[PDB]
Amino acid sequence: EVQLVESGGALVQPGRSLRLSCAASGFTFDDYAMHWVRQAPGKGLEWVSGIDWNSGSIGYADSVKGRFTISRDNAKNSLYLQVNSLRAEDTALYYCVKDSRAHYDILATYVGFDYWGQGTLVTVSSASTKGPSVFPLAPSSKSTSGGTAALGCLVKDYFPEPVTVSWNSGALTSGVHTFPAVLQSSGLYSLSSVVTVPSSSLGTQTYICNVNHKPSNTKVDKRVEPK
Amino acid sequence: NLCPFGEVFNATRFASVYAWNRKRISNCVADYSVLYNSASFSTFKCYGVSPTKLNDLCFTNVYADSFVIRGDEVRQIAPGQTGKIADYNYKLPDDFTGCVIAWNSNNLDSKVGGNYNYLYRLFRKSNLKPFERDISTEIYQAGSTPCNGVEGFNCYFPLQSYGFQPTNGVGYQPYRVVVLSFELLHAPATVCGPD
């Protein structure tokens, strides 16, 4: 299966650099051109840069010319994007995007951009990284609606946006709603992950939410008990 | 004077891969964009040069090699490649500078009941040298017994026919392939793009 795994996105001060990388598998890397397409949070899509199968021809968007540098290592099935002299508008998810042509600037053999990576998040801020605090949203009389009951986890006060929440180590997925983060006035993020379960299950089933904030190396397993 | 790329690409009949056709091109001008922006090419890959730069370069000679192979074998028309076609029929060197153009030719080179006119070499003692064209029908000795030019047990006719029926999968379908090679010698350069 085609798989384009991006990495390198991080919190970086304005003016500094980062090296985005993209490990490719499931197709002959030597055969196709490669592109970087980014997306600002809540905004549209923007093409950044593209490189031929053999680095023979290279393209850059006007907003990034002179600052960004694309490269590829066809032996390591890998693509690179050096972002330098960074500004706030570079804050975006950066998608590795497989081309159908061997060459990015010819019209023959084009059948669209075959596969897109899941992206790596680059945040340009002078704020510092902060790990989150996980608090129970405990089930109670006030959080039941008939036979269905609600519980969850409050993830609060963390600046770098990437955050993951899973329930019972991925074994509980139905009725789970991880909410979009909200930037508080303090400049920090916060969210909640709620689950809906049958009432009879409280006091029989143990519910544990697994919060992961990779920027701060914080992994929390929080047991949500009823009161 | 325009370069006669028409008579190569749009040739009415194509050669077998073992006996591939070479057109030597010199003393003309070409607009390679007519190729790399064609909507009919299914494979278009260039080595050692960028196809968009071709319109600004000059070359001592250009060589257009054309033949027919299977779809599963177009990936063998590349440098450093292994397989029956790459090893016994058509080899490209590692320093190859040119393009490889392929397109599906099912509507032409396959007939009802089968088009058995396109051949390929299945047995050979040694691998081909790059740009070598071997057309011997010499009986291949696959045993310790001399064949003395007589087909038989462990004595194989070296050439195999292609089974091109219109009902085969796109892989086993026929593809016409053109390989452009861009030669830059230490003599005046005479093939160029426009201005």
Next chain:
Amino acid sequence: IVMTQFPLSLPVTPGEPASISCRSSQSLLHSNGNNYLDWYLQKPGQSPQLLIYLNSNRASGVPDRFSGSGSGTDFTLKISRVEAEDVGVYYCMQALQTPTFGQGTRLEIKRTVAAPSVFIFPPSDEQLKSGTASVVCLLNNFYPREAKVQWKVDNALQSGNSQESVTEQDSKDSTYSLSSTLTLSKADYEKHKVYACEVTHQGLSSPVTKSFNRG
């Protein structure tokens, strides 16, 4: 080249076709007769994926319900039978030059009205030990997205101390969920007793209130 999509959000009832427009500044018709325009679908929580290439061709796995049309500076994507999985943003892109995209079109599924399930969570005790109090109000699986959630502390409407978060439309339920979070200091929390979360919605005949006392 500038791509512009007319319907920025398209609400469409299940089973009923949908249609999206795409104008461009230059003609995407080329000498070889092709229109170099693509369609890309970005489903909730995922990167965009190829839907249509070269105006009228489906990528691998794309159902027969998706079709593309147009020529020059005017194109249209059409779905025959919209499904709940079709939720997402549909993007234009041109391949004639370096890739330009359109501002996307959000596809909303016009579902039957669904009242929300209202839940309220008091702050954890270990949160108050840190000097902060978060009171969460949860609205679960409602249609449509328009809800009016107000806090009422000792029967006093609160404003400016709450933040709302809503999920994207579900790919099976076609529903939304909303989280209204009230943040106070431990001092301001202990100054009051009754914490109430009222909710108004189209599927609710009356406003549903979830309240509790501290203790």
